[PDB]
Amino acid sequence: KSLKGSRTEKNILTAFAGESQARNRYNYFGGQAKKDGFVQISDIFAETADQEREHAKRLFKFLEGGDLEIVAAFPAGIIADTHANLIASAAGEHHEYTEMYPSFARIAREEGYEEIARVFASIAVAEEFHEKRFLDFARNIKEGRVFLREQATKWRCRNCGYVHEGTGAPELCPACAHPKAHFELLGINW
Amino acid sequence: KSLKGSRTEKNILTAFAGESQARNRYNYFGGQAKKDGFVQISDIFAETADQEREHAKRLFKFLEGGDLEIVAAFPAGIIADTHANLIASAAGEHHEYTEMYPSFARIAREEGYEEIARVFASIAVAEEFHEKRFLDFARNIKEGRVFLREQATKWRCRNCGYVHEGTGAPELCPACAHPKAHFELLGINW
Ligand SMILES: [Fe+3]
Ligand SMILES: [Fe+3]
Ligand SMILES: [Fe+3]
Ligand SMILES: [Fe+3]
Ligand SMILES: [Zn+2]
Ligand SMILES: [Zn+2]
């Protein structure tokens, strides 16, 4: 059926509004992680910002109407150091998949919108991996393990693809001469 | 010392010219992999194109002069299906780290340019991982293993970050409704 005048109609707009602000906050956090010397984290923030654009797009494509009043609480700010930014983003993520989307998928079901309840539950799966990624990175920073491990691995320069073998990323990449900030652990996922 | 009138001077320009064309070919190949339904491969081509920009930048920053004549053979074309594109790119990669850069680093040494011989040898390391990545992907296509494995894993939608558990990627992502083409094996490298 129609969406107009349901509680799910107001919940889709609230989810779109919260996601639109998260897209912006993650891009801002992405800029600050670049300035903190964490390029791989900067790009994860930007990738996540982008994924928030897409969850907000799927939601928005259900809406059919005009103006709608929302009552809702949002984080009133703060761009801090990258560790705090990672912790505040895991928290926001945390609330979405444990509270907001559960609740919204449940109301959609009650109202006869099973396909939207489906989409709401499916976004939550994505929101869980995002929180886990922010938490592992926050933990790496705090322990001082971003650029140095206990056992020797392969480190890749994200700027030129140079692979380095060692316990830690070199101070400057020898191929492109960009600093340590550009290195990540080498990953293979094919 | 100065670079002008050395064989290394002509070799840096030849390497810059070959890399500049590889940046373009990998971006073209990147567009065709998108049309073939391989988004993760499309983005690796684009990432590699970008890394070729940076190797070419480090090289170019050594040059000091005016015009210089190059005699050199280059691939005179062809944008084909993605598998052939992956095989032709591994080959080009292959020739760079086994023949071109070895030889150029060796001549630079002979001539008293040890730091450029250093940079030439270091780019080759990057060129080896690029060939290995193109070959594993070409092999995945050919065996039909891009979107389906024999044992059950976790598949991630690159468009919205939805994580799926199964032997194969779903036909449409349930969170963003984008097709199979968007999925990759879930990777963790932190
Ligand atoms: Fe999220
Ligand atoms: Fe580098
Ligand atoms: Fe390469
Ligand atoms: Fe998706
Ligand atoms: Zn979200
Ligand atoms: Zn190259």
Swiss-Prot record, chains A, B:
Keywords: Cytoplasm, Electron transport, Iron, Metal-binding, Transport, Zinc. GO terms for cellular component: cytoplasm. It comes from the Bacteria. Coiled coil: none annotated. Fe(3+) 3 binds at C157, C160, C173, C176. NCBIfam families: RuberyRbr. This is Rubrerythrin. It comes from Nitratidesulfovibrio vulgaris (strain ATCC 29579 / DSM 644 / CCUG 34227 / NCIMB 8303 / VKM B-1760 / Hildenborough) (Desulfovibrio vulgaris). The gene is rbr.
